[PDB]
C-alpha cells in the first residue's frame, strides 16, 4: 500500500432527503453530515495525510471546474482540518438546514453521469500519488432516472469508465418511507455487489453505524525499521527486515507559537566562547570527564569509536532450547524479523527452512545484534513464529522470527533476602475460589490509553470550539463495585483465615 487515500462524499439534495418520516428521527441530510464529520475526525486523528472532498449535487447553484449545472463542490480534495469540520457543522442544525437551502437550494434536476464526471475530474486534479480512489454516494433514492432512460445509459457508461479507471464506489443508502431497492438501478453502478444486499432495505445501511464509530488511534503503514544482514557464516549471508509489531504510543510533540499572532516560531541554538565571542562547531570542541581530581579529554570521534565492536547486523552464534528462555528475562519490546529478498536472492528459502526446522526442534537461534554503527552489540534470541489465522481466513500472527533481547549481567539486580512462608491448603483454596469468581477473558486490545484519549478529546474541543470535552470513560479502572457484589462473603472468610483480628491493614 503506497500512496494516499482519496474520499469524495456525494450528498443528494432532493426534496425527499429533507423530510423525516417519524418524529425524533434526524433527517437523512443531517445524518450524512454527521457521518462526514465523524469520518473527517477519524481521518484527522488516525492519518491527516489523506485527502477528503465534499460535493453536493441537485442544488440550484453550481460550482464546478467545468461549470456543470446543478452540481456544487463544497470542498475540493485536500487534507482535513477544523475549518472544513466547522463548515460542515454549519448545516448540522435546522437553522443550518435553512442556511443550506438558502445558499445552495434544492429540488432541481440532475444527472448521475455529470456527478461522476466531476468526481473523476476532481480525482485527476490531485498531483499526489493516490493509493486508493474511493467515492461515497449518500442518497435515499433508488430510481432517480425513472422518467428518462438516456440518462440511465449515460450513468451506466460513466460508472463503467470509473470502474475501469480504478475508482471504487459505494452507495450509502439511507432510510426511505417506502423502501430502498438496490437491485433496481444502482446494482450496475456499485463496484462490488453483495448477494445479501439484494432485498429491499427498510432501515439504515449497516455501513453508517461503522462510519459513525469514531476511532482515536494513529495508523502506521507497514515499514521496515532496518534491512539488516544475518550472517550464519562469514560467507553465508542473507538479508532480513526488522519491524516493530508493538510500539509505544506517544502524543504529538508540542509546537511553539507566537502569542501575538499564533504563528510557528523557528528554534535555533548556537555555541560561542565567552571570551572570543565567535561561533563554534562540533569539530572545534573536546569532551571532558572529571573523576575526582583528574581530567580526561577525548575527541568526539574517539567517544563514538569507544562503542564500536562490529558492523551493523545480526551474526548467528548457535541454537538453544526454548526451555532455557526465561519468561521474566524481559528488557525491551520484542521485534519481528522477516526475509526481504530485495537485496540478496535465495534468502527466502533459507529463512523458511530455518523456521520450519526450528519449529520442529523447538530451538531458538541465538545471535549478536548491532542495530546501527557505533552501537554496542547485544545478545538476542530469534524464536520461530507459526503463521496463525483465525476463522474466515484472517491472519493474526504472521510467519517469521520473534527477536527477544537477552538481559546482560549488569541489567539484573539482586533482590533482598526474604524468608519463605507457605500458605495452608485452606487459604489457597479460598484464593482459588476468589480467582475463579473473578475469571475474565483477556485480549490484546481490551484497554485504551486514558491519557492519549483525553488529550485527543481536549484537542478536539479546542479545535471545534465545543462547549466541553466529552469525558472519555477509562476501562483501566477495576470497577470495584461489580467485584464486591460478585465476590460476596469470600473476602471476609479469606481475611478471617489469614488476617488476624488485630491487624488493621
Amino acid at each position: 500500500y503506497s500512496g494516499r487515500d482519496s474520499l469524495i462524499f456525494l450528498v443528494d439534495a432532493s426534496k425527499a432527503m429533507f423530510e423525516s418520516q417519524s418524529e425524533d428521527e434526524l433527517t437523512p441530510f443531517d445524518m450524512s453530515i454527521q457521518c462526514i464529520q465523524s469520518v473527517y475526525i477519524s481521518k484527522i486523528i488516525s492519518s491527516d495525510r489523506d485527502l477528503l472532498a465534499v460535493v453536493f449535487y441537485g442544488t440550484e447553484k453550481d460550482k464546478n471546474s467545468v461549470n456543470f449545472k446543478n452540481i456544487y463542490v463544497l470542498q475540493e480534495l485536500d487534507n482535513p482540518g477544523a475549518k472544513r469540520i466547522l463548515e460542515l457543522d454549519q448545516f448540522k442544525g435546522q437553522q443550518g438546514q435553512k442556511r443550506f437551502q438558502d445558499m445552495m437550494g434544492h429540488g432541481s434536476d440532475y444527472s448521475l453521469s455529470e456527478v461522476l464526471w466531476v468526481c473523476a475530474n476532481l480525482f485527476s486534479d490531485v498531483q499526489f500519488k493516490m493509493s486508493h480512489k474511493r467515492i461515497m454516494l449518500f442518497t435515499n433514492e433508488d430510481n432517480p432516472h425513472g422518467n428518462d432512460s438516456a440518462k440511465a445509459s449515460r450513468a451506466r457508461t460513466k460508472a463503467g469508465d470509473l470502474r475501469d479507471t480504478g475508482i471504487f464506489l459505494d452507495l450509502m443508502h439511507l432510510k426511505k418511507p417506502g423502501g430502498f431497492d438496490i437491485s433496481l438501478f444502482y446494482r450496475d453502478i456499485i463496484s462490488i455487489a453483495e448477494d445479501e444486499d439484494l432485498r429491499v432495505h427498510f432501515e439504515e445501511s449497516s455501513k453508517l453505524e461503522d462510519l459513525l464509530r469514531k476511532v482515536r488511534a494513529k495508523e502506521t503503514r507497514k515499514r521496515a525499521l532496518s534491512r539488516l544482514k544475518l550472517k550464519l557464516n562469514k560467507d553465508i549471508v542473507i538479508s532480513v527486515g526488522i519491524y516493530n509489531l508493538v510500539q509505544k504510543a506517544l502524543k504529538p510533540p508540542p509546537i511553539k507559537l507566537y502569542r501575538e499572532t499564533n504563528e510557528p516560531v523557528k528554534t535555533k541554538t548556537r555555541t560561542f566562547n565567552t571570551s572570543t565571542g565567535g561561533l563554534l562547531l562540533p569539530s572545534d570542541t573536546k569532551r571532558s570527564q572529571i573523576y575526582g581530581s583528574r581530567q580526561i579529554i577525548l575527541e568526539k570521534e574517539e567517544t563514538e569509536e569507544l562503542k564500536r565492536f562490529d558492523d551493523p547486523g545480526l551474526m548467528l552464534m548457535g541454537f538453544k532450547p526454548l526451555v532455557l528462555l526465561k519468561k521474566h528475562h524481559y528488557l525491551r519490546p520484542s521485534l519481528f524479523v522477516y526475509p526481504e529478498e530485495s537485496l540478496v536472492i535465495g534468502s527466502s528459502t533459507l529463512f523458511s527452512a530455518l523456521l520450519i526446522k526450528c519449529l520442529e526442534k523447538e530451538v531458538a537461534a541465538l545471535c549478536r545484534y548491532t542495530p546501527r554503527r557505533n552501537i554496542p552489540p547485544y545478545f538476542v534470541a530469534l524464536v520461530p513464529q507459526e503463521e496463525e489465522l483465525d476463522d474466515q481466513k484472517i491472519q493474526v500472527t504472521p510467519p517469521g522470527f520473534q527477536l527477544v533481547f537477552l538481559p546482560f549481567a549488569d541489567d539484573k539486580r539482586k533482590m533482598p533476602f526474604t524468608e519463605k512462608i507457605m500458605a495452608t491448603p485452606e487459604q489457597v483454596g479460598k484464593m482459588k475460589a476468589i480467582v475463579e469468581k473473578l475469571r475474565f477473558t483477556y485480549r490484546s486490545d481490551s484497554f485504551e490509553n486514558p491519557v492519549l484519549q483525553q488529550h485527543f478529546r481536549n484537542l478536539e474541543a479546542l479545535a471545534l470550539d465545543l462547549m466541553e470535552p466529552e469525558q472519555a470513560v477509562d476501562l483501566t479502572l477495576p470497577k470495584v463495585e461489580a467485584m464486591n457484589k460478585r465476590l460476596g462473603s469470600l473476602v471476609d472468610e479469606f481475611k478471617e483465615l489469614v488476617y488476624p483480628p488485630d491487624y488493621n491493614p
Binding site: 501575538e260 474541543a461 470550539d465 465545543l466 462547549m467 466541553e468
Partner: protein, 255 residues
C-alpha cells in the same frame, strides 16, 4: 481617533452575530493591538460564548472576560466606557476588589442611581432562592409595607385583614368542601386582593364572611365567645363595595 492607545486585546468570540474577523479588524483600525492569545500585558478578553477556552480563562483567575457588547457600545460612542458588572463575565481578584467597594455584590451600584431597565437587570442577576416560608414571607412583606407607608395600594388593601369563609359544612374539616357558586369566587377575589384565607379556623382569624346561608350564624356566634379576640361576620356586599370604590369600606354597615 485613537481612543484605544496601545492596548492589548484578546478576542475569543465564536457563535455570535458579529464574527471574529470584523471585531479584530475594528480593534486593529481603532489604534488597538489585537492578539490571538492572552498574556501578562492583556487587560481584558472579549468572549461572546462560554466555550472551553473561556471556561479555562475563567478558572485561571488572572484575566477579565468581557462580553462583546462592551466593545460594540465603545464603538457606538467612540469613547472608553467604564466597566460594569453586566459586561463582565469574570472578575480578577483586583477587579473584584475594585467592584466590591464601588458596586454591590449583585449587579447594582451604591452611588449611581437605578432606573427601570437597570433594576430589571439587577433582579435578573439574582436567582430565586427557597430559604423563605409562606407565613414568614407574608409577615415580612406586611412589615415592609407598613414601615414605608405602602398601605394605600389597591391590591394590598386586605393585607392586614384575614378572612375566613363558610365554604365547609363542618368547621376545621377539609373533607367537607362545599360546591358554592358565589362563595368560591368571592374567596378567590379576596385572596387575589391580598387577603389571607385559611382553611382551618385558628386563633389568628380576624374577619369572617358568610353568604346567604344564615343557619351557621349561631354556630359562629357561639364559637367567637370562646375566642380571646372576637371576629366579625360581614355580608358579601362589603367586599364588592370595597373593590368597586377601590378602598376599604367600614364594616359597621355590613356587620
Amino acid at each position: 481617533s485613537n481612543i484605544f492607545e496601545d492596548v492589548e486585546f484578546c478576542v475569543m468570540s465564536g457563535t455570535d452575530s458579529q464574527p471574529k474577523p470584523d471585531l479584530e479588524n475594528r480593534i486593529a483600525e481603532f489604534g488597538g493591538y489585537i492578539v490571538q492569545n492572552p498574556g501578562p500585558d492583556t487587560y481584558c478578553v472579549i468572549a461572546g460564548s462560554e466555550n472551553i477556552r473561556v471556561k479555562n480563562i475563567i478558572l485561571s483567575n488572572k484575566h477579565d472576560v468581557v462580553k462583546p457588547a462592551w466593545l460594540l457600545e465603545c464603538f457606538k460612542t467612540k469613547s472608553f466606557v467604564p466597566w460594569q458588572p453586566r459586561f463582565m463575565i469574570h472578575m480578577c481578584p483586583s477587579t473584584k476588589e475594585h467592584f466590591a467597594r464601588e458596586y454591590d455584590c449583585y449587579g447594582d451600584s451604591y452611588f449611581i442611581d437605578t432606573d427601570l431597565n437597570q433594576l430589571k437587570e439587577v433582579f435578573s442577576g439574582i436567582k430565586n432562592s427557597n430559604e423563605q416560608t409562606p407565613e414568614e414571607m407574608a409577615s415580612l412583606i406586611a412589615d415592609l409595607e407598613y414601615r414605608y407607608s405602602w398601605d394605600c395600594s389597591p391590591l394590598s388593601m386586605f393585607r392586614r385583614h384575614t378572612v375566613y369563609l363558610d365554604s365547609y359544612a363542618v368547621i376545621n374539616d377539609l373533607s367537607t368542601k362545599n360546591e358554592g357558586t358565589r362563595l368560591a369566587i368571592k374567596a378567590l377575589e379576596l385572596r387575589f386582593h391580598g387577603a389571607k384565607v385559611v382553611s382551618c379556623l385558628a386563633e389568628g382569624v380576624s374577619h369572617v364572611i358568610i353568604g346567604e346561608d344564615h343557619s351557621r350564624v349561631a354556630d359562629f356566634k357561639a364559637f367567637r365567645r370562646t375566642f380571646k379576640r372576637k371576629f366579625k361576620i360581614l355580608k358579601e356586599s362589603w367586599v364588592t363595595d370595597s373593590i368597586d370604590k377601590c378602598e376599604l369600606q367600614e364594616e359597621n354597615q355590613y356587620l
